[PDB]
């Protein structure tokens, strides 16, 4: 029922998985801030990356599906009355991590959803396949709010799909690093990172 809804739904990574992903994120920043291919393109990133993305989530990482504001968000009730939503509540999932991105605003991870997980998914509003926004925020610039992460990921996918993917500029240990221009960086993983999580609601 509407009034019992959560603030939002999502895949909340397990402690072990959350920490794995948190670790892997900081390595991408440690290795990105020191990659010469990035040090030249600092004019288009700014006027140490871990510190730049100093606003990090304070608990476990999670992949948001539907912001609900306790039933009073747009479409909140309808998402909740879906048979997949009320049945997969409290069930455990295995998300795939596709790439890790870095813009001058936010740093995050991209999620590729299985057809079954996509049943839980509710400008960039156009052209791309569903669930393309699916992510995990790993950091934010001091003055940037986290919802920005979803739109940068879409901005990158409108680019790679656009053809402006741009050839490889750097080889990292976990995958090849690409540079899409306006301070946007992407690490496409040689082996996708499988991360465990639970589908549930966030309360207070």
């Amino acid at each position, epitope marked *: 029922e509407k009034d019992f809804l959560p603030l*939002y739904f999502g895949w909340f990574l397990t402690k072990k998985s959350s920490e794995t992903l948190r670790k892997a994120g900081q390595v991408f920043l440690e290795e990105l801030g020191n990659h010469k291919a990035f040090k030249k393109e600092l004019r288009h990133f700014i006027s140490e990356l871990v510190s730049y993305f*100093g606003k990090r989530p304070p608990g476990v990482l999670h992949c948001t599906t539907k912001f609900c504001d306790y039933g*009073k968000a747009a479409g909140a009730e309808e998402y909740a009355q879906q048979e997949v939503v009320k049945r997969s509540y409290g069930k455990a999932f295995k998300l795939s991590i596709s790439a890790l991105f870095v813009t001058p605003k936010t740093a995050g991870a991209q999620v590729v959803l299985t057809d079954q997980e996509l049943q839980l998914w509710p400008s960039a509003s156009e052209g791309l396949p569903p669930g393309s926004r699916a992510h995990v925020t790993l950091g934010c610039a001091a003055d940037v709010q986290p919802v920005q992460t979803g739109l940068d990921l879409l901005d990158i996918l409108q680019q790679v799909k656009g053809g402006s993917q741009g050839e490889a500029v750097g080889e990292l240990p976990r995958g090849k690093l690409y540079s899409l221009g306006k301070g946007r960086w992407m690490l496409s993983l040689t082996k996708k990172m499988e991360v465990k999580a639970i589908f549930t609601g966030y309360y*207070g």
Partner: nanobody
Amino acid sequence: VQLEESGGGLVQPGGSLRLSCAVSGITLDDFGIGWFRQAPGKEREGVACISPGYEHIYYADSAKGRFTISRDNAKNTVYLQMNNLKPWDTGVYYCAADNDLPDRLWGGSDWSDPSPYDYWGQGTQVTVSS
């Protein structure tokens, strides 16, 4: 539970105004505050926001550098310093309080969406002549 704005009125272009809300029955340690503007016929559009986590102070691109939001938690009053004001800022500036700041930021909500807020002030009328 009361948010009373104040400090609005007339000002010429380029002038400055400092709005103030006296939050009551709620505390700025638990609630983030959004300052909103409602101009004639437009919809409520967020100008600035301060959450209790202190690293969450945001500004709308229009007022990113002209305005400054702050709090004196001792006086549980929030402030909005507006510099180099233009007629396009004319509007009613309302003050909103939301206990899910910053939590919702990390779960798909935008600070400037006014729907998630929980309590709204009465609005102080601001007007930049011409």
